[PDB]
Design a protein around this nucleic acid. Sequence first.
RNA 1: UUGGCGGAAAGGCCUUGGGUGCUUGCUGGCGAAUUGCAAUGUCAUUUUGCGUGGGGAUAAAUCAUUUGUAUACGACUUAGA
RNA 2: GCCCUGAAAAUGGAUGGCGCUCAAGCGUGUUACCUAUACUCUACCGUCAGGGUUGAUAUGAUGCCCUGACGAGUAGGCAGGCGUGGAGGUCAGUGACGAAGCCUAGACCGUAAGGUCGGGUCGAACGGCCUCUAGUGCAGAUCUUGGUGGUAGUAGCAAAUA
RNA 3: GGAAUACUGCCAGCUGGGACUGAGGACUGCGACGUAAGUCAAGGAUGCUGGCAUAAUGGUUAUAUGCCGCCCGUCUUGAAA
RNA 4: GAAAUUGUUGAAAGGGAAGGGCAUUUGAUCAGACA
Lengths: 197, 126, 106, 156, 61
Amino acid sequence: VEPVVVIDGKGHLVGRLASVVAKQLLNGQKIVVVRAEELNISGEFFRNKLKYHDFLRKATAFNKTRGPFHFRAPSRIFYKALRGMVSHKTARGKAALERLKVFEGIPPPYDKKKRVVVPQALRVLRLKPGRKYTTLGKLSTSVGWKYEDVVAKLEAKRKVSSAEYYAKKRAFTKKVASANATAAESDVAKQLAALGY
Amino acid sequence: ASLPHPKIVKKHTKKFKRHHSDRYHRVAENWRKQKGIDSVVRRRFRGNISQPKIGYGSNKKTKFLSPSGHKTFLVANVKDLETLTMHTKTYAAEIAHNISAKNRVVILARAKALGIKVTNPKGRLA
Amino acid sequence: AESHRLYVKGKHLSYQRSKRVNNPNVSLIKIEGVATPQDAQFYLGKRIAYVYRASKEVRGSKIRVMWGKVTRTHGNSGVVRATFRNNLPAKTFGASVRIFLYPSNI
Amino acid sequence: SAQKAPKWYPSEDVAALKKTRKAARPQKLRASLVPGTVLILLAGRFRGKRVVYLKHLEDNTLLISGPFKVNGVPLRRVNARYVIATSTKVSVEGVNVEKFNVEYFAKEEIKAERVEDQKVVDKALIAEIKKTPLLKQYLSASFSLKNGDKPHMLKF
Amino acid sequence: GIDHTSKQHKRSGHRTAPKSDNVYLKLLVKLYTFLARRTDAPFNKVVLKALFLSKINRPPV
RNA sequence: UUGGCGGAAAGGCCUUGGGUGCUUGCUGGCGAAUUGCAAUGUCAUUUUGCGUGGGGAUAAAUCAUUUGUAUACGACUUAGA
RNA sequence: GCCCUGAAAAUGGAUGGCGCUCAAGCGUGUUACCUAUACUCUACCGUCAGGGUUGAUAUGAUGCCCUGACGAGUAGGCAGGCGUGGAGGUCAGUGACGAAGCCUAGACCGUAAGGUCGGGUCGAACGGCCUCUAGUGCAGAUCUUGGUGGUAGUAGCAAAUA
RNA sequence: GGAAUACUGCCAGCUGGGACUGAGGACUGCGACGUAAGUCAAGGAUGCUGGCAUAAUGGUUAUAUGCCGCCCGUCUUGAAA
RNA sequence: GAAAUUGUUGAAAGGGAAGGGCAUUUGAUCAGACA
Ligand SMILES: [Cl-]
Ligand SMILES: [Cl-]
Ligand SMILES: [Mg+2]
Ligand SMILES: [Mg+2]
Ligand SMILES: [Mg+2]
Ligand SMILES: [Mg+2]
Ligand SMILES: [Mg+2]
Ligand SMILES: [Mg+2]
Ligand SMILES: [Mg+2]
Ligand SMILES: [Mg+2]
Ligand SMILES: [Mg+2]
Ligand SMILES: [Mg+2]
Ligand SMILES: [Mg+2]
Ligand SMILES: [Mg+2]
Ligand SMILES: [Mg+2]
Ligand SMILES: [Mg+2]
Ligand SMILES: [Mg+2]
Ligand SMILES: [Mg+2]
Ligand SMILES: [Mg+2]
Ligand SMILES: [Mg+2]
Ligand SMILES: [Mg+2]
Ligand SMILES: [Mg+2]
Ligand SMILES: [Mg+2]
Ligand SMILES: [Mg+2]
Ligand SMILES: [Mg+2]
Ligand SMILES: [Mg+2]
């Protein structure tokens, strides 16, 4: 319903989230994905690392610059999973892919906005308890991602500022809540209660 | 001016062009039926051009009717124009391409007096 | 007030189609707030308009409209089928359409 | 001869039509349409206005009034399929509307008689409107759809 | 699809008119066409069919 | 207009003071028509061009010439009021 | 039963792809839903079959009309039509006030073969209909003759002392 | 001991919403409702109303978008090869 | 004074061919009734 939907990628299964976003883009909804380094994939870490090495060895024999490109960043790994679910070789597919943005961490434009989640793709709601899963941030580092520590340091700074904002918002909400309760027991409040509001 | 008629329906307005007439200059657009053993057009594979067939035939009540509702009848002088005197609601006169400019003036004047519609009244007008 | 909307927002998804063949004469329409075939029965027969803009002004306006209506439901998720006087262009897959409240049975 | 004349010509006479069996019968309105019901106009110049339904005319049209003094909608005709019937009612006994018919709205500035009978009809309506609180303010406002409003679940 | 038990669009195989262009013969066919339709007499139907026969099928008597 | 904060793509957020407009928190009085029974019935933001006047600033590159740390040709690297 | 060991091939790689783990996997059960040139109903075209109607004063009894069913197709058969050179007849046909030919993302008719018209160019003959006749219809045959391209301003224009 | 409900089946029971279609063209048939005259949903659509009368609908053409489409001819069991 | 092929002018499209079928948008262009 929002003109732009911002999805927090933490705790989401990569494949199920990718299917949801691909349909949203084709239907005409702009999507922004943040914290791609906190994505989850079902299965043990060693299994997924072996799968990526199978992907690594595929390349054009006579020229390596022509073959498949192996992007190591967590945001580009999710982008690969999403491009495969869109007909990206058509003009309709190209237009849909321009409605999507994926970032590691939460960049300054979106750190003061609202983030939503997709229950269909949440790991805590889908995987059976006890099943092993892997985190996309550590998988990317093992295959040659260089900016894991930089994102971690910046995210720590963002949380300090975000926590300070929440403390002031909590204090103001307590003041507002008391006034609404104080404003009760009046004739206007009783009439609103009869109508459901 | 013509008699009332049911709505005219054209089953296939698009021209039937010969296969590969847009690929080689030597192949004209006049329709020819493909007779090759392996031809995809003859075997009617999906995505290829359609071929003429009797199923496209137009309704007999509206066949040969111009959009104005009249049937075209070619005339060359005054004498054959007057054959449409009692049939002004079903036939419209068309002047032949090789009629001189001065003879067209006489035909048009007579047609107006008789109330006969002319489909090409602007030909060879000074 | 700040709102003057008297229609329900909708999206043009695609044509009626099989896996490999499409049918431009029928368009599939998604209506916001409708997620059930039972709920989609309310909008059957309602007029639908697609509003777009052009550079050239023709009849004292630079806004053009294509009219249609809802025919039947589609699937189990509240999608409906629609037919327009002229078929919607394929570039409008994902564009917005307006579903009016007339004709009314309320 | 440029073209050979046809031997047969079709008849110029036009045949008569067969006798049609289609008898006109009066329209039956839906049960929600009762005189004195507040209606919401869905289209036209006065779209979104809340008016009062008065009488059902002979050409399958509804006679409505704003009233003109409340929301500026005069005595007009509307189509039953382009309105929404609400659950609120206004008493109509005491309002004379038998003078208005199809010929009254003949097409052929504003005439003098249209002004006078507007005030006569509205005066009786306004007296009944004052009976219930906040109804006059309700008629002055316009209806609109808000975000999250689902017409298939809204009750009028 | 229809599982046809017989050949489709099959002509009757009998002459329905004379092959010749004789104007006077066609007049006789027109006369006995009317008689065969509105007399219910078996003689008229036999004569009408005999007028369609070819030369080898009408030997001299 | 005052002060503070924000560099991950900050281009935003918060705050001080006065001026002015509106206020449907409540009670009033006038205006609406005729778009004729519906026709998006036009109220958005993209880029560019030509004319107004209120400020602001007064360069370089290439060819040709020259160099050999360069060089198939282009290119590269130097010099010259 | 499922899973695992047994289980080694050469360009990089394929449950169709992405991806999927109380599955989007395997076995099984219950419903909803999607869509073929198939099925049902209607319109229109054609084909075949069975029938109606000669009565003058209005024209086609090879006419007009009513009813039912049917429609794939190489090799091949048959039927109805379109177009071309020439011939008999006819339209007391068209034409230097412009015949034929040619050009024309201009118009109209026919399912189609094709026919008709407007505009431009041009300069001396040509067409409709009823019949007769044939050296009568081209995309191919490493087809015949003639003309013209890409290659391409490319290969190259360096033996014999200057 | 006395009912209800579930499941399955029937009704020449009633009723709301949506979509596609309007072939035919004087009369003739079979019925229905009526004491009658007549009427009717009974062998195929009529009634009422509005806007525009022109590039608005539509045709042609170029382009764009969705889906689909391998080079014809020939020999061959089999040809995009 | 046709075609192949070519120059100039005008319009349009072009991310490893081009061309085609069905449908509609946009641009250009055009016949038919005003009874
Ligand atoms: Cl150099
Ligand atoms: Cl033809
Ligand atoms: Mg590296
Ligand atoms: Mg055509
Ligand atoms: Mg074959
Ligand atoms: Mg054919
Ligand atoms: Mg299963
Ligand atoms: Mg079918
Ligand atoms: Mg056949
Ligand atoms: Mg000439
Ligand atoms: Mg041309
Ligand atoms: Mg001469
Ligand atoms: Mg020969
Ligand atoms: Mg040919
Ligand atoms: Mg040739
Ligand atoms: Mg051949
Ligand atoms: Mg050759
Ligand atoms: Mg050279
Ligand atoms: Mg040499
Ligand atoms: Mg030498
Ligand atoms: Mg159009
Ligand atoms: Mg394909
Ligand atoms: Mg072989
Ligand atoms: Mg072949
Ligand atoms: Mg010359
Ligand atoms: Mg040429």
